[PDB]
């Protein structure tokens, strides 16, 4: 229940995330836009910062989400270590120019950087993310605001992200008042309707992983793909909903939002300026195996985050593995890196010798994690790229057994027994086969926006704000079709929010 103890913990967990977001957005402008840090160097510095901040205030407390920096195709999972930088090169050495940013660590111009992170205190957690964008510099200008706005489909994506974010914020604010809503009381039906029509206006589809949901203590949705739950009220937009919208558990009907509750928003929009046609938007995993295929568009990598399934137990033969398991289970149920578990990781002072100390510890931790993973104690949080499939291949396909195809050597089970589209009787395995079975291997760029809110009378928005996620000014088109019900409602909502009360937590200096 929303006690003072609960909500001030939420606040002090949130604004740490806010100031760390400011730190990263600081550093990236320092590095690229200003007169050069790589992705994995940003990540552990951000986590060091967050823990150094956490120490001052406050027993279970730490990083829910390790800071993830997706670039231009990846829906989620990219957050590598310093161990893996040469490995990424000598794996992707023969591939082509795409994914050069994520491979090398140096970011390019026009590169759509989706940052995300989160922090938790006693199970009360706050996630946040922001799609920012790189654009080259002005040199003749004195102040050098960097030159050019964005124009294309990525601009579409950013616009849809921000607009969907503000609209759902306002909707969940009107959840307090059964009034101050255009009748054009609140339901996942309405939420999915307004966000889908925004996506359709901007020609940017919703990604399967996106959601809006309730939160409770220790139960946020940090994983959302591995661990299960019976009591989960919230909305998702996956391939089943895509096919249903083309036609015409997570129940959406018996769901009306109430006072005194904490919610997570997480929206992912994949742009369509090419593609030519109607088609599906699904996800494909990234493995470390160069040898499964010959094509150059594929990315080869190793995920850094893990999560451990405390239900299972197995004595290890290996001292290093058992010590690392001690270090793990003394942490919590949230995902983690190997760098988080170490002796010198927060970097009270920072030099090269401490990074070297961390690297040696990492060399031991990978050996421990080998045995901890060969037994099914810990699993990887997968790296997922958005990939497009036209309906032509799917409808012309041949699936000799539908609703019965497992994938049988997928290790997690829950991404195995999925059945994304029950109609047409195709499963994830045959969908992967069809996605690969075509020279229309079109991968989409994606934009991401994540916030945490709580309903008391005001909407207390524990993340976001204008300091945080002010958008990179851009130049998009398809800017919001008027002459419909829902668009009138959305504009009335945006005007009426200026009076509804939205409190917003500021970052820490």
């Amino acid at each position: 229940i929303l006690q003072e103890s609960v909500l001030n913990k939420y606040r002090t967990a949130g604004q740490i995330a806010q100031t760390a977001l400011k730190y990263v957005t600081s550093l990236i402008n320092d590095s690229y836009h200003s007169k050069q840090l790589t992705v994995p160097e940003l990540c552990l510095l951000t986590d060091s910062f967050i823990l150094t901040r956490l120490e001052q205030y406050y027993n279970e407390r730490g990083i829910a989400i390790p800071t993830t920096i997706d670039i231009d195709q990846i829906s989620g999972g990219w957050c590598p270590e310093i161990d893996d930088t040469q490995n990424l090169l000598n794996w992707n050495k023969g591939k082509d120019s795409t994914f050069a940013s994520s491979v090398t660590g140096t970011l390019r111009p026009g590169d759509l950087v989706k940052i995300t992170l989160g922090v938790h205190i006693d199970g009360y957690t706050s996630e946040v993310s922001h799609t920012m964008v790189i654009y080259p510099v002005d040199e003749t200008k004195p102040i050098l605001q960097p030159t050019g706005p964005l124009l294309g489909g990525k601009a579409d994506a950013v616009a849809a992200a921000h607009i969907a974010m503000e609209t759902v914020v306002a909707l969940l604010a009107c959840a307090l008042t059964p009034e101050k809503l255009p009748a054009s009381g609140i339901t996942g039906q309405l939420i999915r309707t307004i966000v889908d029509t925004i996506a359709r206006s901007y020609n940017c589809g919703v990604v399967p992983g996106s959601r809006v949901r309730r939160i409770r203590r220790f139960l946020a949705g940090q994983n959302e793909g591995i661990v299960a739950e019976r009591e989960y009220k919230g909305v998702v937009w996956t391939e089943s909903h895509q096919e249903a919208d083309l036609l015409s558990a997570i129940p959406s009907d018996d769901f009306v939002v109430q006072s005194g509750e904490v919610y997570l928003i997480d929206l992912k929009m994949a742009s369509l300026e090419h593609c030519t046609k109607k088609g599906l938007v699904t996800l494909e995993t990234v493995d470390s195996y160069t040898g499964k295929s010959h094509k150059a568009g594929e990315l080869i990598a190793r995920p850094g985050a893990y999560v451990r399934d405390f239900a299972q137990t197995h004595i290890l033969k290996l001292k290093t593995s058992r010590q690392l398991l001690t270090k793990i289970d003394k942490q919590g149920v949230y995902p983690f890196k190997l760098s988080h578990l170490s002796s010198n990781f927060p970097f009270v002072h920072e030099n090269e010798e401490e990074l070297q100390s961390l690297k040696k510890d990492l060399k031991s931790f990978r050996l421990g994690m080998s045995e901890i993973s060969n037994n099914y104690l810990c699993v990887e949080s997968p790296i997922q790229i958005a990939r497009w499939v036209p309906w032509d291949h799917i409808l012309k396909a041949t699936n000799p057994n539908g609703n019965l195809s497992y994938d049988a050597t997928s290790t997690l089970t829950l991404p195995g027994h999925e059945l994304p589209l029950p109609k047409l009787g195709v499963s994830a395995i045959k969908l992967k086969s069809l996605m690969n079975s075509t020279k229309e291997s079109i991968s989409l760029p994606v934009a991401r926006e994540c916030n945490t809110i709580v309903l008391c009378p005001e909407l207390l928005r524990l993340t976001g704000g204008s300091k945080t996620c002010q958008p990179s000014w851009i130049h998009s088109q398809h800017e919001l079709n008027p002459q419909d019900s829902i668009v009138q409602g959305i504009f009335q909502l945006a005007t009426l929010a200026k009076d509804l009360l939205l409190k917003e937590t500021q970052p820490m200096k």
Binding site: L246, L247, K278, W391, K423
Partner: peptide, 16 residues
């Protein structure tokens, strides 16, 4: 023959 009908309707929607 439900797959027949749903594929017919889906062809109808994607062709236009």
């Amino acid at each position: 023959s439900s797959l027949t009908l749903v594929k017919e309707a889906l062809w109808s929607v994607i062709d236009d």
